[PDB]
Amino acid sequence: TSAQKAKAEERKRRKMSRGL
């Protein structure tokens, strides 16, 4: 919920590697 206002950006740092 309130995380959707940022979590989407928190993955931009984890996907850089496991972005598949």
Q: Vertex 12, ends 9 and 6: CA angle to 5°?
A: 10
Cα–Cα distance measured from residue 15 to residue 9, given in angstroms and rounded to the nearest whole number: 10
Cα–Cα distance measured from residue 18 to residue 5, given in angstroms and rounded to the nearest whole number: 22
Cα–Cα distance measured from residue 4 to residue 6, given in angstroms and rounded to the nearest whole number: 5
- Please name the method used to determine this structure: NMR
Q: Which residues of 1-20 are buried (b: 16+ CB within 10 A; e: fewer)?
A: eeeeeeeeeeeeeeeeeeee
All residues at 6 or more sequence positions from 4 whose CB lies less than 8 Å from its CB, including other chains: none
Cα–Cα distance measured from residue 9 to residue 16, given in angstroms and rounded to the nearest whole number: 12
Cα–Cα distance measured from residue 3 to residue 15, given in angstroms and rounded to the nearest whole number: 17
Cα–Cα distance measured from residue 10 to residue 4, given in angstroms and rounded to the nearest whole number: 10
